[PDB]
Design an enzyme around this catalytic site. Structure first.
Site, PDB file in Angstrom:
ATOM      1  N   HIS A 116     -38.909 -21.119  55.619  1.00  0.00           N
ATOM      2  CA  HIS A 116     -38.103 -19.890  55.615  1.00  0.00           C
ATOM      3  C   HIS A 116     -36.919 -19.984  54.689  1.00  0.00           C
ATOM      4  CE1 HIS A 116     -35.507 -22.124  58.460  1.00  0.00           C
ATOM      5  NE2 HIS A 116     -34.557 -21.336  57.993  1.00  0.00           N
ATOM      6  N   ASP A 131     -43.199 -24.040  59.860  1.00  0.00           N
ATOM      7  CA  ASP A 131     -42.035 -23.926  58.991  1.00  0.00           C
ATOM      8  C   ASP A 131     -41.854 -25.161  58.110  1.00  0.00           C
ATOM      9  OD1 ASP A 131     -39.784 -22.821  57.916  1.00  0.00           O
ATOM     10  OD2 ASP A 131     -38.515 -23.123  59.668  1.00  0.00           O
ATOM     11  N   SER A 133     -31.062 -25.776  57.873  1.00  0.00           N
ATOM     12  CA  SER A 133     -32.492 -25.587  57.746  1.00  0.00           C
ATOM     13  C   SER A 133     -32.990 -26.344  56.558  1.00  0.00           C
ATOM     14  CB  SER A 133     -32.805 -24.123  57.556  1.00  0.00           C
ATOM     15  OG  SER A 133     -32.161 -23.349  58.530  1.00  0.00           O
TER      16      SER A 133
END
Ligand code: NA
Length: 229
Positions: free
Chosen positions: A42, A89, A178
């Site tokens: 993402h 992810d 992230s």
């Protein structure tokens, strides 16, 4: 990184700070190879060629004269990652130059999916807070599927995702982390990667944990994708 201390310069030197002048995005990452970075699906938009992303490495201090900035060449996003759940992810990024620093080994089995994981990135230390300038480090315990399952208000996918951190303690990864690796030592005294920082309900919340892409489940599928890059 909520309630972390400072990474010593060179401590985790497979660390990358990512900035995507395309989608306007700031992630973490790890050098799977010296010119391939492991990171979050993402944190990027599609697969294919992309000259847009700027990985900085070598420094824990985002500014030092010394950082190495290298532009992406092509991006490989896990096909099947759904924005809708941050499921599956993971994504690779090729670099134009290679970065001559030491790289992070990935778990290819589940052997290491217990106990205390080390996490790091340049993300916010307060929920809602600014990104940092110096790489922060923190420790977070493995949380079971079950334990995590119950505690979560979004849905958690069995082997694709793995949970970590505390009930109440102010120590968790946060917005801007992230793509950074969750890792820990293996039996042969080497860091192995078990997670990519993926998502969480807020940062360091009361009764809430941190979710991480379970490297071990995709390690296979990952290993196979770098070899085409
Ligand atoms: Na907590």
């Amino acid at each position: 990184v909520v309630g972390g201390t400072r990474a010593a310069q060179g401590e985790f030197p497979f660390m990358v700070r990512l900035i995507n002048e395309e989608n306007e995005g700031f992630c973490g990452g790890a050098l799977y190879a010296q010119d391939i970075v492991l990171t979050a699906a993402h944190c990027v938009s599609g697969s294919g060629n992309n000259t847009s992303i700027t990985a900085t490495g070598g420094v824990v201090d985002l500014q030092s004269s010394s950082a190495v900035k290298v532009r992406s060449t092509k991006v490989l996003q896990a096909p099947g990652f759904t924005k809708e759940t941050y499921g599956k992810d993971w994504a690779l990024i090729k670099l134009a130059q290679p970065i001559n620093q030491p790289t992070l080994k990935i778990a290819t089995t589940t052997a290491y999916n217990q106990g205390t994981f080390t996490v790091a990135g340049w993300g916010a230390n307060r929920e809602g807070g600014s990104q940092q300038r110096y790489l922060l480090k923190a420790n977070v315990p493995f949380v079971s599927d079950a334990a995590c399952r119950s505690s979560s208000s979004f849905i958690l996918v069995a082997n694709e995702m793995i949970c970590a951190g505390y009930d109440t303690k102010q120590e968790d990864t946060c917005q801007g982390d992230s793509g950074g690796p969750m890792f820990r030592k293996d039996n042969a005294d080497e860091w192995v990667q078990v997670g990519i920082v993926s998502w969480g309900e807020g940062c360091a919340r009361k009764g809430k944990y941190g979710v991480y892409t379970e490297v071990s489940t995709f390690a296979s599928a990952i290993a196979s994708a770098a070899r085409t890059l």
